[PDB]
Amino acid sequence: EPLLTPAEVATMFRVDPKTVTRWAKAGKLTSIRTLGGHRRYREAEVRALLAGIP
Amino acid sequence: EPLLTPAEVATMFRVDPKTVTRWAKAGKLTSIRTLGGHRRYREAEVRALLAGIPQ
Amino acid sequence: DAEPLLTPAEVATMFRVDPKTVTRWAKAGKLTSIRTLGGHRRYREAEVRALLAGIP
Amino acid sequence: EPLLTPAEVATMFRVDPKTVTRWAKAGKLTSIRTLGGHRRYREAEVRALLAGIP
Amino acid sequence: EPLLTPAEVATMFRVDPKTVTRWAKAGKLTSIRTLGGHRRYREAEVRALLAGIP
Amino acid sequence: EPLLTPAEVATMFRVDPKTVTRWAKAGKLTSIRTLGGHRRYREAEVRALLAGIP
Amino acid sequence: PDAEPLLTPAEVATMFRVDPKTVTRWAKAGKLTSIRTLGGHRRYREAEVRALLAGIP
Amino acid sequence: EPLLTPAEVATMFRVDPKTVTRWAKAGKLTSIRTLGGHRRYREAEVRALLAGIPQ
Amino acid sequence: EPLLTPAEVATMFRVDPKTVTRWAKAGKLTSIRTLGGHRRYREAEVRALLAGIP
Amino acid sequence: AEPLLTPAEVATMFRVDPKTVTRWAKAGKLTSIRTLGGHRRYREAEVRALLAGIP
Amino acid sequence: EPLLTPAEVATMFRVDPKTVTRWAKAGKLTSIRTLGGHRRYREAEVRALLAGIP
DNA sequence: TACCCGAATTACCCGAATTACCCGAATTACCCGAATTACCCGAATTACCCGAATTACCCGAATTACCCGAATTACCCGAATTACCCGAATTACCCGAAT
DNA sequence: ATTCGGGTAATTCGGGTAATTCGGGTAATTCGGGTAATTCGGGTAATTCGGGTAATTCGGGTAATTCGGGTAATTCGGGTAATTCGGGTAATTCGGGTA
Numbered sequence: 001e002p003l004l005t006p007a008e009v010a011t012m013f014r015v016d017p018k019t020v021t022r023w024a025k026a027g028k029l030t031s032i033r034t035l036g037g038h039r040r041y042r043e044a045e046v047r048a049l050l051a052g053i054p
Numbered sequence: 055e056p057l058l059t060p061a062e063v064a065t066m067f068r069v070d071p072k073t074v075t076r077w078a079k080a081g082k083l084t085s086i087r088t089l090g091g092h093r094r095y096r097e098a099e100v101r102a103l104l105a106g107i108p109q
Numbered sequence: 110d111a112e113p114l115l116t117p118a119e120v121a122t123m124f125r126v127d128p129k130t131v132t133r134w135a136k137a138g139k140l141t142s143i144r145t146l147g148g149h150r151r152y153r154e155a156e157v158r159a160l161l162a163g164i165p
Numbered sequence: 166e167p168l169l170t171p172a173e174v175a176t177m178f179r180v181d182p183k184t185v186t187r188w189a190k191a192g193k194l195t196s197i198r199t200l201g202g203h204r205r206y207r208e209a210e211v212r213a214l215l216a217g218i219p
Numbered sequence: 220e221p222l223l224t225p226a227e228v229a230t231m232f233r234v235d236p237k238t239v240t241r242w243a244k245a246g247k248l249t250s251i252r253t254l255g256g257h258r259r260y261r262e263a264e265v266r267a268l269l270a271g272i273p
Numbered sequence: 274e275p276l277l278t279p280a281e282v283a284t285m286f287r288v289d290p291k292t293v294t295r296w297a298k299a300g301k302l303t304s305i306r307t308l309g310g311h312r313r314y315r316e317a318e319v320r321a322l323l324a325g326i327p
Numbered sequence: 328p329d330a331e332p333l334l335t336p337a338e339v340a341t342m343f344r345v346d347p348k349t350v351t352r353w354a355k356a357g358k359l360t361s362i363r364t365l366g367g368h369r370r371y372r373e374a375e376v377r378a379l380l381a382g383i384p
Numbered sequence: 385e386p387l388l389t390p391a392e393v394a395t396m397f398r399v400d401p402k403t404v405t406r407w408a409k410a411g412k413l414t415s416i417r418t419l420g421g422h423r424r425y426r427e428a429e430v431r432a433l434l435a436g437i438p439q
Numbered sequence: 440e441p442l443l444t445p446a447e448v449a450t451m452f453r454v455d456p457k458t459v460t461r462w463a464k465a466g467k468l469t470s471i472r473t474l475g476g477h478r479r480y481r482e483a484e485v486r487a488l489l490a491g492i493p
Numbered sequence: 494a495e496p497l498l499t500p501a502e503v504a505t506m507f508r509v510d511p512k513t514v515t516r517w518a519k520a521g522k523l524t525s526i527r528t529l530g531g532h533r534r535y536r537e538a539e540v541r542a543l544l545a546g547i548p
Numbered sequence: 549e550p551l552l553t554p555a556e557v558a559t560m561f562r563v564d565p566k567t568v569t570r571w572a573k574a575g576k577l578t579s580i581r582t583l584g585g586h587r588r589y590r591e592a593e594v595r596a597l598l599a600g601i602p
Numbered sequence: 603t604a605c606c607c608g609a610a611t612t613a614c615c616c617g618a619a620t621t622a623c624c625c626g627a628a629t630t631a632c633c634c635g636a637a638t639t640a641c642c643c644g645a646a647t648t649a650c651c652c653g654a655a656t657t658a659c660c661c662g663a664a665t666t667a668c669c670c671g672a673a674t675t676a677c678c679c680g681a682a683t684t685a686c687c688c689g690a691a692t693t694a695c696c697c698g699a700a701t
Numbered sequence: 702a703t704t705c706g707g708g709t710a711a712t713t714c715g716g717g718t719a720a721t722t723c724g725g726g727t728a729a730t731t732c733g734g735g736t737a738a739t740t741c742g743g744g745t746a747a748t749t750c751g752g753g754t755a756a757t758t759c760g761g762g763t764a765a766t767t768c769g770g771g772t773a774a775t776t777c778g779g780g781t782a783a784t785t786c787g788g789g790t791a792a793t794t795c796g797g798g799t800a
Contacts (some may be wrong), residue, residue, distance in 0.1 A: 003179035014057035014094045029087045035193045036629045040179045068114040070149045077146045090620045118697045149794050168233035199249045201638045205233050222287035254301045255647045260285040276344040308358045309656045313344045333398035365412045366665050372399045387453035419467045420674045422731055423451045441509035446500040475683050479508045497562035518747055529571045532693045534562045564694055584701045586704055
């Protein structure tokens with residue numbers, strides 16, 4: 001799978017990482033976790049979101 | 055693509071954000087919703103409009 | 110990279126002139142205009158403040 | 166056993182190989198040194214941590 | 220003594236057979252010669268080196 | 274005169290019974306044929322060549 | 328003396344690194360000379376044997 | 385009548401004398417006991433059986 | 440009385456001249472002494488034993 | 494007229510070489526009777542006796 | 549004198565008549581021929597000889 | 603220039619939801635020289651695909667080997683007896699004629 | 702029938718070495734029976750031999766990945782402010798005309 005860092009995600013949405021987080025822990029964004037406990041998101045679904053395909 | 059928040063698109067027209075909405079609500083300005091509903095506009099599309107190129 | 114604009118009434122007030130007389134100055138092109146998506150104009154601030162000092 | 170290079174382990178998590186290494190040095194991952202020094206990882210173990218199965 | 224082909228050793232270390240042969244020339248590993256020149260390596264020691272025993 | 278069947282001889286070199294039959298037919302190994310034709314090789318001959326003593 | 332030195336299948340077998348049963352078939356194939364003991368066992372001319380190991384039909 | 389000792393037969397057939405004795409006892413061979421009891425054998429007979437001539 | 444020498448009796452049974460003597464002293468054979476010491480043996484008696492009739 | 498035996502005859506009785514029977518007589522184990530020529534002759538009774546072992 | 553025929557001389561000496569006739573002819577035995585030629589030998593000369601007194 | 607009139611577009615008030623920016627702790631991204639590993643490339647040594655042939659191997663049955671203490675038999679030996687060895691002289695045995 | 706008489710071949714003198722033999726003693730052999738390995742019949746499964754093509758590994762080189770370690774940038778966390786959402790009513794602007 002191809003992952004995005006929160007920084008990258010936040011950018012495509014013109015939003016703040018702390019939001020993508022609240023977005024993810026609010027269950028709107030499937031998240032993976034780094035062994036260090038940092039999040040990572042599935043590009044495919046991020047894109048699918050921007051293009052507005054629920 | 056580089057986006058602008060309504061607060062920004064508004065300041066580029068000396069116009070209230072709430073009007074920037076109407077524009078997008080009538081399809082005069084492509085919009086991109088964040089997961090929360092808040093809109094967000096394509097910097098490209100705005101610059102081209104300040105120049106006056108119908109889209 | 111952003112042009113500061115003025116609302117017509119904002120420009121009018123700056124000349125003790127009426128808004129509908131700014132439109133004239135616009136449709137006669139002594140003043141640069143930028144249209145909103147609705148149709149209403151807005152004017153380049155650096156431009157008017159220049160006319161005040163009298164600098165064509 | 167099938168193995169992974171620190172290049173690959175990092176690519177899967179979207180992380181720097183200089184960090185996958187810090188992971189092993191902290192014990193969060195099984196390392197297997199080559200005769201030269203380079204590390205190497207167990208594919209199973211890694212793909213287990215993506216799904217988050219500690 | 221049981222033996223492995225350089226390819227085999229490579230697969231085990233997730234490393235190029237070329238590299239296994241570099242290891243050989245550098246004494247990091249015992250080689251054994253076929254009457255055609257091909258190196259064969261003692262399973263005993265490679266298996267121990269994975270483990271981490273010089 | 275103790276000997277080794279090609280099977281055995283090749284299991285010591287990590288090689289195919291074909292390649293042994295090459296070495297003999299090429300002249301790097303003393304061969305001894307049976308009434309049937311199957312080759313068979315001087316026992317020591319081999320182990321010697323295992324250390325590097327032609 | 329007037330006596331052919333003989334070998335037992337086991338012994339011949341050892342020399343060729345081969346199973347008795349195989350030598351015992353080299354016999355019934357006329358590739359070798361068989362001498363039957365009064366009981367049935369084959370014995371082989373040590374002379375004939377040693378020869379073939381050098382490649383001399 | 386040129387005779388052979390049991391060992392002599394044995395040495396000819398590549399066999400242990402106990403077997404040559406076992407033969408004369410199984411009747412497959414003419415035995416000639418000495419005054420003491422030890423078996424002796426007729427050379428001709430032995431020579432034949434080597435060739436392959438039953439008798 | 441046709442007579443046999445010990446060397447004669449011996450070659451007949453495939454035995455040693457000495458043994459034939461031991462046979463004589465054991466009374467298994469009628470010996471007849473020369474005027475010197477040597478013994479002779481009655482052929483009738485000897486031929487009869489090789490057959491199998493005491 | 495004693496019944497007489499020639500050396501060849503005595504010899505043949507003992508399975509011996511005549512040349513030896515002479516040594517018997519030349520030594521005294523036997524009675525010799527010389528012919529005019531020189532040859533010896535032997536007393537049959539005497540010989541016939543020594544066969545049974547009668548000194 | 550008392551006389552013996554050549555046979556009677558022969559038989560006594562265990563010898564063939566011709567020998568007697570040769571003993572006589574030689575001059576070792578006194579003979580006296582009949583009218584017809586056949587010889588006769590002195591019985592008392594003969595016996596003196598079997599004993600052996602020249 | 604104003605100020606005149608429909609039609610339109612734009613600027614506020616709001617309550618509820620969303621998202622920005624604040625502290626510090628913790629994880630992570632590239633920094634660098636130095637070493638290790640991946641590929642790029644021809645002559646050569648290996649690894650399997652193939653059918654005919656040889657060898658290895660599985661089976662109950664019979665034959666062959668080697669266990670033992672007792673008995674008989676083969677040599678090691680020194681001294682006497684006996685076998686053949688040489689020429690020359692003695693004996694037997696082969697033919698007619700007579701006794 | 703024997704002898705005379707007369708010419709061989711076989712025997713027996715004479716004397717001297719090899720060869721047997723006698724007499725007694727010790728290691729090798731055969732004797733009388735029992736138990737485990739080897740061969741004995743034929744048949745199936747596995748190895749090898751003859752030759753042919755592709756993948757590997759032998760020879761040496763430059764670029765990339767990784768290593769050891771050390772600051773900045775980011776991302777963990779919560780916790781108010783400020784934007785934005787969605788709906789509603791007046792203010793401004795748009796398009797022209799006359800004093």
